[PDB]
């Protein structure tokens, strides 16, 4: 029963019949970042007390997983005689490839197997609509797993589509190159997927959701006195995803319902880069409403300089109080359509935007843009790692010559 | 070096048989599994036997005499001009070998000379006389450097963390790949507040048992971890994480080189903070 946002608090005290969700995610967290996000998902329960999401944790370092809290030991999957890949992701792709490793195919049996156990019925009903794979780009185990997953969904290894929740690394030239090769592999796969599947078809890679660790830290230090920024960042991105999954299945509207089918379409069909903006609304007036939607989109936890003009679909909803007449007001509807319009004119792509009724005293506004192309953070990362990588080709040489240029005289010794 | 060289000594090669042999007995399986990941060779630079052995080892790892990489734990001499020249010729032979190793092996490759760890006998005495009433300074210095190395070997295999695990693979990478000069700072932490935490990390690095005026700016890799109590909320605190990243940052900005820094959970009532910098160039104590 994790409750890691005060939206989740206020809709579990209020609502004691939260018994379903819009999409039955099967969560797999690879590498430690992934493990920790996965551990949060595993914690969530319904009002009745059942678990929401079947969850596995995967790693090479058996020691990243020993301080998990909601993931039972049985569900902590790890690989033998391997102490860890060492911030090098080609170690994971290798352990699973016949060409390099001989028992490669053996490992896949234990993956196919523990997949079978956690996401399958007594029959073989996959008990899951799509897989959510959590990664921290930059590390060995995580980034490697990312690549292996791309490779696996080509052999149609998974029963259903795969959503990847990927985090971009803060600032370390080895991590940046790792992150860049994955993001590049993803951009390629997405382009191949665009030529192989129709605009209407269900995609095998449902979407990829990025967070940027730089942007997330910036935010956290703007907003009992110890704060693990990672712990906070995780709470925000995970609780947001959980919220947008709860709400359509559990709250409704006299005006425009955003139901679960709309969300499933959003997460299933576009098949590219997806972003979310969660905006709290306290001041019921247009100037503030605007500057918080704009803020959640541009300076929020899921912002990575996204290419909104390339979005092919939208979704969203404002959870609002039963009374607050400020939302029935048309003048308020236009301000949203035109505010979001500045990113993508909403007529020009397919979607829906709802306004469900909730118990509480404030309005939370969730905005989702899907089908976008590669985020521009990719370029600025490429550029940031160049000014470090090249800055220490200089420093390695700056002092390797200092080696060559100065012998010290010890002729008096030998 | 003479007793082991055909050019000077004739039964030179005979001696190597008894070395190859007693190596075989102590570090090999009933099969020939070397039962050992790397060799730790302890020396006191300055003497005959020790310093000589140091040179012979450099020579031996070139003929690929050893099954696996070699770490050398070398101590620098206190103050005797014959000992200093001896120490200097070895340290010079090491700087040369390390430079040859840099051109022959990749930045990713396992190095045959895994690393060299120096202690300076002057710096170690200074410390011991700042900190039953007899004290053999050598006996104490040894206890500190050896127990530190043992600690950093125990901890990753035996203690873990909900936040960031520093596991054994991370340590093996640290000790295996950089292949140059390596240092350690062991800092006890009693006062849970930022000003003190800092001034003990800084102290362990600059005025500790492994300090020899190291060239931190030349470090190519880092590692470390703070063993902390299960409860002490002062370590979950972010404000405490930043103070470490920026404190260590003053030696080498930690983004600029490859590593990891963990915070394992332990039983006890205080926090011990181990910091390791590897891949460094020749220490300034040499000058």
From Swiss-Prot, chain A:
In the GTP-gamma-S-bound filament structure all subunits bind Mg(2+), in the GDP-bound filament less than half the subunits bind Mg(2+). Gene3D superfamilies: Tubulin/FtsZ, GTPase domain (3.40.50.1440). Coiled coil: none annotated. One of its GO terms (biological process) is plasmid partitioning. GTP binds at residues 32-33, 140-142, 213, 230, 234. Consists of two domains: a nucleotide-binding N-terminus that hydrolyzes GTP and a C-terminus domain necessary for polymerization. The domains are bridged by a long, central helix. The C-terminus is required for binding to the TubR-iteron DNA complex; its gradual deletion leads to decreasing binding to TubR-DNA. Interactions between the C-terminus and the following monomer drive polymerization. The C-terminus is required for filament formation. In the absence of GTP's gamma phosphate the intersubunit interface is weakened, linking GTP hydrolysis to treadmilling. Forms filaments; a 2-stranded filament forms with the non-hydrolyzable GTP-gamma-S which is probably a precursor to the 4-stranded filament that forms in the presence of GTP. The 4-stranded form binds GDP. In vivo polymerizes to form dynamic filaments that often extend from one cell pole to the other, moving in a unidirectional manner. Filaments polymerize at the plus end and depolymerize at the minus end, a process called treadmilling. Polymerization only occurs above a critical concentration, it does not require upstream tubR. The tubC DNA-TubR complex binds to TubZ. This is Tubulin-like protein TubZ. It comes from Bacillus thuringiensis subsp. israelensis. The lineage of its organism: Bacteria, Bacillati, Bacillota, Bacilli, Bacillales.
């Amino acid at each position: 029963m994790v409750l890691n946002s005060n939206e989740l608090e206020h809709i579990h005290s209020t609502n004691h019949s939260v018994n379903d969700i819009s999409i039955r995610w099967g969560v797999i967290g690879a590498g430690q970042k992934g493990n920790k996000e996965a551990d949060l998902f595993a914690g969530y329960k319904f009002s009745n007390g059942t678990t929401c999401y079947p969850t596995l944790a995967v790693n090479f370092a058996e020691s990243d997983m020993m301080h998990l809290q909601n993931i039972i030991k049985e569900d902590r999957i790890h690989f033998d005689g391997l102490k860890g890949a060492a911030r090098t992701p080609s170690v994971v792709t290798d352990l699973f490839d016949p060409e390099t490793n001989p028992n490669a195919n053996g490992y896949l049996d234990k993956l196919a197997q523990e997949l079978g156990r956690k996401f399958t019925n007594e029959e073989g009903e996959v008990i899951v609509d799509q897989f959510l794979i959590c990664l921290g780009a930059g590390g060995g185990v995580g980034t490697g797993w990312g690549s292996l997953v791309l490779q696996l969904i080509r052999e149609q290894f998974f029963p259903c589509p795969v959503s990847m929740l990927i985090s971009l690394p803060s600032g370390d030239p080895d991590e940046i190159n790792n992150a860049l090769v994955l993001l590049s592999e993803i951009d390629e796969f997405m382009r191949e997927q665009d030529r192989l599947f129709g605009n209407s078809d269900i995609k095998p890679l449902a979407n990829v959701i990025v967070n940027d660790n730089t942007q997330m830290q910036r935010i956290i230090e703007s907003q009992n006195r110890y704060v693990n920024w990672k712990e906070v960042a995780n709470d925000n991105v995970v609780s947001t995803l959980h919220e947008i999954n709860i709400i359509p299945e559990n709250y409704g509207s006299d005006n425009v319902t955003y139901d679960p089918s709309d969300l499933i379409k959003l997460l299933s069909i576009p098949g590219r880069f997806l972003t979310i903006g969660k905006a709290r609304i306290a001041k019921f007036d247009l100037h503030s409403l605007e500057n918080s939607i704009k803020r959640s989109l541009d300076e929020g936890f899921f912002s990575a300089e996204h290419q909104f003009e390339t979005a092919t679909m939208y979704g969203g909803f404002v959870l609002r109080p039963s009374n607050a007449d400020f939302f029935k007001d048309v003048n308020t509807e236009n301000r949203i359509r035109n505010t979001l319009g500045e990113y993508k004119r909403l007529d020009e792509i397919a979607g829906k935007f709802g306004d469900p009724i909730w118990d509480n005293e404030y309005a939370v506004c969730y905005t989702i843009f899907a089908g976008m192309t590669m985020p521009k953070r990719y370029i600025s990362l490429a550029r940031e790692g160049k000014e470090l990588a090249e800055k220490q080709e200089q420093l390695r040489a700056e002092a390797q010559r200092k080696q060559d240029e100065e012998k010290v005289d010890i002729s008096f010794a030998t």
